[PDB]
Amino acid sequence: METVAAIKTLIQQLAQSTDQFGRAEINDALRELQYSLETPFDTVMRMSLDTCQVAVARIGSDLGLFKHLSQCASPQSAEELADHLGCGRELMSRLLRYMASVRMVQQTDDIKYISSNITQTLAVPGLEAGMRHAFENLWPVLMALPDFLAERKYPDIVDAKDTAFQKAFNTDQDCFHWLATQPTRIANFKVLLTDERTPNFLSTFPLEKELGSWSAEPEKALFVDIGGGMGHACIRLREKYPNQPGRVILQDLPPVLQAAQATLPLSGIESMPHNFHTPQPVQGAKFYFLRLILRDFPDHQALEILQNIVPAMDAESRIVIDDGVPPEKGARWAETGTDICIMSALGSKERTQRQWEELAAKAGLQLQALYQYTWPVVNAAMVFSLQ
Amino acid sequence: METVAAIKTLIQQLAQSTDQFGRAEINDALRELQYSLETPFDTVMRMSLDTCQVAVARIGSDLGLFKHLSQCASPQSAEELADHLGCGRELMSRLLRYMASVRMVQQTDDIKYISSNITQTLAVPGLEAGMRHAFENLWPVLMALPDFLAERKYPDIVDAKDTAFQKAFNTDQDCFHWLATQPTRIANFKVLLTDERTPNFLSTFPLEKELGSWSAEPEKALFVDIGGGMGHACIRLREKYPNQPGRVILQDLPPVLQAAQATLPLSGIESMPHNFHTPQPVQGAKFYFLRLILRDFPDHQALEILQNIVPAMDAESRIVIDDGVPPEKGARWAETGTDICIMSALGSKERTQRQWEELAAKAGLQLQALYQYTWPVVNAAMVFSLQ
Ligand SMILES: Nc1ncnc2c1ncn2[C@@H]1O[C@H](CSCC[C@H](N)C(=O)O)[C@@H](O)[C@H]1O
Ligand SMILES: Nc1ncnc2c1ncn2[C@@H]1O[C@H](CSCC[C@H](N)C(=O)O)[C@@H](O)[C@H]1O
């Protein structure tokens, strides 16, 4: 139809006219429009069939199809893709036809296949690891959730050792300890840490304003990245503020600190093994940074993590929580869906700004500023001080 | 934003101006636009989180939340819904917040919850049964598909007894025989048959033209509904052509024929137990009707079903296959996703128009006409004759 072509042309022009945050708003609008115009039959057909995307993406990941296709300079038929990757010709054909229908690849007028924007994404190892994480970990969790809540007469999940994860994987350990005994899952989790989300808090964080007259002399610590993974926040800090004095310390576990040495700058950033369930060793640091850490623990354990940092704070010291702050109403699917997943696997929760201040007050902390850096799904850096 | 409000209003006006087929075109365009304007990070987030909808819908079905909410004349807070349904107040709150974000319910400005169009859909027993089927029968099979194809070095699946279904449920039976030994699954499958798809082939089927000078005298059968479920095709046939003489026979298994007696007309439609893997008993009938039947069997078993009907055909007899006919290129997700699901659970396949004629030629049949009645996803009634 000419009308649907006019809609595509029109919405494309509007998307290119705004920024990434305007585009995120448009995508949520297209999603609500789809859900509001589907017939009752289409609704069930949509929920049933969108499950296939994760499973089919995993199949393509196991075959290296997205990586191989991202390096092809010419359209490929189904037969050669099946032969080069070692797959049955008929099986490959049906997979590609499905992928093309959900834009996982692109199909040409002569029934050949090229890469789409989703194909390039699935070839990036950090993002491909996120999709495999969804298939092999959270899917099973999610699938055990409804029968788990029925047997327990629908309780409020508040314990990391009593949630759907235990029934899903037939163990009594929590998700963190159980992961260490699984080598292939640890390997994938390591690749997953190499993906750097963008933008980061430094795009709106007024460092100099929050710094004040704090002095790095003699050799105080400027930035302590507690559970910092590959140290992306540390790296982006030295890049944006290379002249700012003060130590920049990446704290994590020895396994991931060893992996981070490959991509760390030769100087500027210290690697320091630390378990944040234990007292913080660095004293009087300006910023203690927690990005996507406290959302993986229930309120009683997230408080313990904060209670181990408080004894090491000066009056100039600030605890910075970089995490999602969903609104009290009108929350988007990207911040309510994660809330259900971490509840089922970790017994934790997403927290509104109010739930953050209530958790922080129990540690003796007080909110000083809140600097959002994503829209419409809110990721903010919350600056906390003593008193 | 004012911009996203203008898009919603504009597409709503265009949606109400066209028919159901035009709206299906618009929804598919909105989906392609969503997939093409999402950041690489959003793509992974979408596949991860859209999985929750099936799990969350199953939870709401287990609580009767969608049925209860569809009967409320005033907005309900999370606390009152939790108490009436026997659910934890905090657990209910997070569930409603997630449902609201995916339009599974609607949230009000004062944080209360009412029904949406999806809520009414999930309250219809036939559609709720379709969602429960996806959770308990489809989802597991899919979860087992990628590891199944890896162990077998990615073969072409052509056998109903050697697919992901066997690994998913740790049995050696095919899906049909294993289903009979499961009481709760049989009950849900029975409710699933009560949902009537719309429109049906009678919206474009030229009965009088295809009927010709066929005489019902002495007592020939006009319509034989082979595997007809609740007999919806039979009922809509007596309704649209009530004066057309001839017997209208609904054929299925004793379990579902007995369940269909509740909604069958008092007269007009005969119920006849029959197993379509056995020779057809009704002789010289005008139309032998197969709706969504041959889609569930591989080529070797689907042919036997046709080979059992051929011996009962006159020269005037016609076999009518009502099924999906996806195009050779550009197939929509609704007809490629089902192809992957029936491959994984039943070892069968969706068939293009030529693949249908190739299957019918092996039975001695010849395509006479093809009457589409859905767009853009093609469901057609294909009229076959002998020779
Ligand atoms: N007990 C513990 N002590 C210290 N670090 C831990 C820990 N348990 C988990 N972690 C670390 O916490 C990290 C969470 S992933 C978050 C990484 C970083 N905050 C970012 O967003 O870029 C993982 O890298 C993991 O190694
Ligand atoms: N071996 C068999 N013999 C006869 N009917 C069978 C059968 N195996 C399955 N069926 C029936 O075939 C139907 C498939 S779903 C049927 C939907 C219906 N024919 C429609 O037009 O929409 C079920 O009702 C099931 O009971």
Author numbering:
A (entry chain B), B (entry chain A): 1 to 387
What text appears in the publication on this structure?
Recently, the novel multifunctional S-adenosyl-1-methionine (SAM)-dependent enzyme LepI, located in the PKS-NRPS gene cluster for leporin biosynthesis, was characterized in Aspergillus flavus. LepI is considered as a SAM-dependent methyltransferase that can catalyze stereoselective dehydration via three pericyclic transformational processes: intramolecular Diels-Alder and hetero-Diels-Alder reactions and a retro-Claisen rearrangement. The overall structure was found to be largely similar to that of SAM-dependent enzymes,28–31 exhibiting a core α/β fold of alternating β strands (β1–β7) and α helices (α1–α19). This structure exhibiting α helices and β sheets comprises an all-helix amino-terminal domain (NTD), a carboxy-terminal domain including a substrate-binding site, and a SAM-binding site, which is formed by a seven-stranded β sheet rounded with five helices.
To better understand the mechanism underlying LepI inhibition by SAH, we determined the structure of SAH-bound LepI at a 2.7 Å resolution. The overall architectures of SAM/MTA-bound LepI and SAH-bound LepI seemed similar. SAM or SAH binding with the enzyme occurs at the inner surface of the pocket and is primarily mediated via ionic bonds, hydrogen bonds and π–π interactions. No hydrogen bonds form between Leu292 or Ile293 and SAH because of the absence of a methyl group, which decreases the binding affinity between the region (amino-acid residues 291–296) and SAH. However, based on structural observation, one additional salt bond appears to form between Arg291 and SAH. The close similarity between these two complexes revealed that the reactivity of LepI might result from the hydrogen bonding and positively charged nature of SAM vs SAH, but not related to structural reason. Although SAH-mediated LepI inhibition probably proceeds via the failure of a stable interaction between SAH and LepI. Overall, the present results suggest that SAM may stabilize one active state among many available LepI conformations through substrate mimicry, thereby activating the pericyclic reaction; however, SAH cannot completely activate the pericyclic reaction of LepI because it lacks of sulfonium moiety for catalysis, whereas MTA occupies the substrate site.
